[PDB]
Design a protein around this ligand. Structure first.
Ligand SMILES: [Mg+2]
Ligand SMILES: [Mg+2]
Ligand SMILES: [Mg+2]
Ligand SMILES: [Mg+2]
Ligand SMILES: [Mg+2]
Ligand SMILES: [Mg+2]
Ligand SMILES: [Mg+2]
Ligand SMILES: [Mg+2]
Ligand SMILES: [Mg+2]
Ligand SMILES: [Mg+2]
Ligand SMILES: [Mg+2]
Ligand SMILES: [Mg+2]
Ligand SMILES: [Mg+2]
Ligand SMILES: [Mg+2]
Ligand SMILES: [Mg+2]
Ligand SMILES: [Mg+2]
Ligand SMILES: [Mg+2]
Ligand SMILES: [Mg+2]
Ligand SMILES: [Mg+2]
Ligand SMILES: [Mg+2]
Ligand SMILES: [Mg+2]
Ligand SMILES: [Mg+2]
Ligand SMILES: [Mg+2]
Ligand SMILES: [Mg+2]
Ligand SMILES: [Mg+2]
Ligand SMILES: [Mg+2]
Ligand SMILES: [Mg+2]
Ligand SMILES: [Mg+2]
Lengths: 192, 126, 59, 136, 79
RNA sequence: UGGCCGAUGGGCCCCACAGGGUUACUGACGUCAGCCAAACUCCGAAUGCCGGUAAGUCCAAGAGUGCGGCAGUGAGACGGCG
RNA sequence: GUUACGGCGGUCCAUAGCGGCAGGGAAACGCCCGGUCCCAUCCCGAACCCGGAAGCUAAGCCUGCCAGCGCCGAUGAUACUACCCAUCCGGGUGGAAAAGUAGGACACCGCCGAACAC
């Protein structure tokens, strides 16, 4: 599993603080900070439009290369600040990383399959923590369900994982639980 | 295979010793003119220091470890009396006469009492 | 150095501390011209009352 | 009919609502959920009605959550009593909400039906809301 | 309908009363704390009601030692 | 609020002194995570206040504190802030 | 001067605690041997105290290693707010958090006293 760099230009922000931050945000540029072992953290602006587009196209996780006045850096996204209402991005964090290093990544998982009439679908956890290489960051996870009955607690560590990744999360965690479907009696019992 | 399921007597003992000395140390405000006389006793030796807490630095001290004092075949009452006399004369040489006594966490009686007396009639008035 | 200070808005209805700082500066009536030393302290004064005064720098 | 079963005291002062909702600002648990927009009260009756609207349509599949819970009491002095003479009695409980909060959370296979049910929930809710998914 | 509440107490006006770095004279009160929010230091007296004062001219000085709060007076140099 | 082993509902279809909710329960603890509080704070500001120093208005505000003669007023309103 | 030693001390007293692992008895430290005499058990030499050094460092202590947990903590942003504003409606300058994040991290140091060396 290998991905493709998502090139994007950026500029060193001129002014630091709420004033410049909000002015840039109104303009349409999100403030951004990158840091790492380079012992040289510094701060830059992005393009909201291309930024959100790339976020969508590559999922929660993506490995990127950044344009700094002609300098090209490799970093992986760590944390974000999404607008509570607007659906816009306030702040992203790019952590410098080189090829051939270990990082901790949380990966989402999707569920698909066929469910029996007496089967109830429930998802306790939508994300799991995994260790992998910089160029081996996935974006989705899938699990197959077919003909499950009664108690079908699916273990997170029971899932089959591609090569090069170690399950950071302990095996005690549960990913998908299937329980007996409720009826009218249970529906009326709950909530009162 | 060792699994601790409780507490330890000697550990709590050392902690308690420090605790109980803490009450007196709390009050003690002993300057250069009135240093604090600290007494430590072991199962095999006794140790005493005279210090001024202002700098946390000692002035004179002695203990059963020194060869000449060990030369005394007697027991720890005699050892304590001799050591206290040494403390008294060393303090006199250094030029300190009036001081305060620290109970050193131990209860008064026996060896501590002998040391206190020896220091008293050795010229050290405290 | 020196500073030219001239009050550009009336003192009325302004915070009491601001009015007193204005008196300290020494501006009695609006649009009075006053010359003052360029110390950090007077600079802070002007910064505080900036919404009432305009500063013209001389020397 | 959610209600705390015991508190230190049966009445609380008027609120301050200023501030952006920080708690639970991002969907987590299921795969879809509502997000309100404007400060407002939400009564236990409103919450229960929305829960009924979601649940009864979804029927068999999927299971829901409720990230909020009405805790703070309220009072209203009965009619025909000149104001004064102490605090009134509590009538309903309400849960506060701030812009950006997530109200309900769903994990059901289909986006279309999830959207439809949550849309009815919106219509039955007292304040604006909109769909939002897990993604970053 | 009638209320059973509505009573209160006086206002003792507690709280620190000479602040750090001030110049205080002998027998001067420093704090009025119900509990031991602070702790005596050299030249400070522990009052009959957990009150703090000074037993010698000087400048009061707060300071944290061993993770508590204790008040103390540094005798200002004699001019 | 939703999950996890859950022995042991700290317990049940035959009570064996021994296998399973062989039975959908209860499940305690804890742990995974997500809120809330004027009488919760393992945290914590801009402000405001008190203390020291220095410049400035220093042909005086008509600045302060004390003492002395003098009366008013102790029915507030509104607006912005909490 | 060294030390794999003991006391007293410090420090906006956890970067200094907890957990697991390994190692110490020359001296000192602990445990330790027995209660005529001091002294004590609301009974007990468990605690203390006292006499002695036969034995051993397992416990405790110490030191060294481990990031399992505590723990400190950036830059940046966000919350917040002093002052001012425009016919509400939020911005301009000033101040700048909490949590989270890279990371840091398995204390440092003072005075005396003990064993090797001068
Ligand atoms: Mg309010
Ligand atoms: Mg309030
Ligand atoms: Mg609504
Ligand atoms: Mg009161
Ligand atoms: Mg959360
Ligand atoms: Mg509070
Ligand atoms: Mg408190
Ligand atoms: Mg106040
Ligand atoms: Mg001052
Ligand atoms: Mg005049
Ligand atoms: Mg008069
Ligand atoms: Mg009069
Ligand atoms: Mg009246
Ligand atoms: Mg009146
Ligand atoms: Mg009135
Ligand atoms: Mg009034
Ligand atoms: Mg009115
Ligand atoms: Mg008003
Ligand atoms: Mg030996
Ligand atoms: Mg015995
Ligand atoms: Mg051992
Ligand atoms: Mg041990
Ligand atoms: Mg901590
Ligand atoms: Mg630690
Ligand atoms: Mg900073
Ligand atoms: Mg204004
Ligand atoms: Mg407006
Ligand atoms: Mg911080």
């Amino acid at each position: 599993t290998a991905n493709i760099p998502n090139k994007l230009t950026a500029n060193v922000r001129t002014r630091t603080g709420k004033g410049a931050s909000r002015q840039a945000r109104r303009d349409g540029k999100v403030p951004a900070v990158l840091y790492g072992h380079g012992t040289d953290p510094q701060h830059l602006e992005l393009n909201a439009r291309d930024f959100a587009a790339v976020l969508r196209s590559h999922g929660t996780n993506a490995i990127l290369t950044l344009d700094i006045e002609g300098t090209e850096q490799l970093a992986l996204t760590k944390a974000l600040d999404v607008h509570p209402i607007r659906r816009n991005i306030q702040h992203a964090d790019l952590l410098v990383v080189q090829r051939g290093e270990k990082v901790t990544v949380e990966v989402t998982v999707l569920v698909e399959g066929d469910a029996t009439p007496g089967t109830l679908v429930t998802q306790d956890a939508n994300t799991i923590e995994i260790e992998a290489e910089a160029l081996s960051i996935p974006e989705q996870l899938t699990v197959s369900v077919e003909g499950v009955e009664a108690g079908t607690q699916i273990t997170a560590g029971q899932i089959s994982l591609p090569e090069g990744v170690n399950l950071i999360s302990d095996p005690e965690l549960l990913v998908v639980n299937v329980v007996e479907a409720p009826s009218a009696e249970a529906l009326e019992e709950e909530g009162a | 295979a060792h699994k601790p399921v409780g507490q330890n007597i000697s550990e709590v003992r050392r902690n308690a010793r420090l605790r109980r000395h803490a009450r007196l140390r709390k009050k003690v405000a002993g300057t250069a003119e009135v240093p604090r006389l600290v007494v430590n006793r072991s199962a095999r030796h006794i140790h005493v220091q005279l210090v001024n807490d202002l700098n946390g630095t000692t002035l004179a001290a002695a203990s059963s470890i020194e060869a000449d004092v060990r030369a005394i075949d007697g027991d720890k009452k005699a050892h304590s009396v001799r050591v206290g006399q040494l403390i008294a004369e060393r303090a006199k040489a250094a030029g300190v006469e009036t001081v305060v006594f620290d109970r050193g966490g131990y209860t008064y009686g026996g060896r501590i009492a002998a040391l206190a007396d020896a220091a008293r009639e050795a010229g050290l008035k405290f | 150095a020196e500073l030219k200070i001239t009050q550009v808005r009336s003192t009325i209805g302004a915070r009491w501390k601001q009015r007193e700082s204005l008196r300290t500066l020494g501006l009695k009536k609006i649009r009075q011209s006053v010359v003052r030393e360029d110390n950090a302290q007077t600079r802070g004064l002007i910064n505080t009352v900036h919404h009432l005064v305009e500063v013209e720098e001389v020397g | 009919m959610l209600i705390p079963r015991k508190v230190k005291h049966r009445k609380q002062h008027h609120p301050e609502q200023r501030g952006i909702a920080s708690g639970g600002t991002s969907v987590s648990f299921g795969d879809y959920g509502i997000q309100a927009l404007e400060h407002a009260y939400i009564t236990n009756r409103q919450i229960e009605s929305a829960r009924i609207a979601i649940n009864r349509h979804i029927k068999r599949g999927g299971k829901v959550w409720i990230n909020i819970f009405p805790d703070r009491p309220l009072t209203k002095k009965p009619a025909e009593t000149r104001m004064g003479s102490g605090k009134g009695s509590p009538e309903w409980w309400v849960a506060n909400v701030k812009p950006g909060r997530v109200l309900f959370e769903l994990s059901y296979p289909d986006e279309k039906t999830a959207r439809d049910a949550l849309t009815r929930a919106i219509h039955k809710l007292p304040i604006k809301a909109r769909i939002v998914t897990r993604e970053e | 309908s009638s209320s059973r509440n509505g009573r209160d107490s006086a206002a003792q006006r507690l709280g620190v009363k000479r602040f750090g770095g001030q110049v205080v004279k002998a027998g001067e009160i420093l704090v009025r704390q119900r509990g031991t929010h602070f702790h005596p230091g050299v030249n400070v007296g522990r009052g009959g009601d957990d009150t703090l004062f000074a037993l010698a001219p000087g400048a009061v000085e707060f300071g944290a030692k061993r993770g508590r709060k204790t008040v103390n007076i540094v005798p200002v140099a004699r001019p």
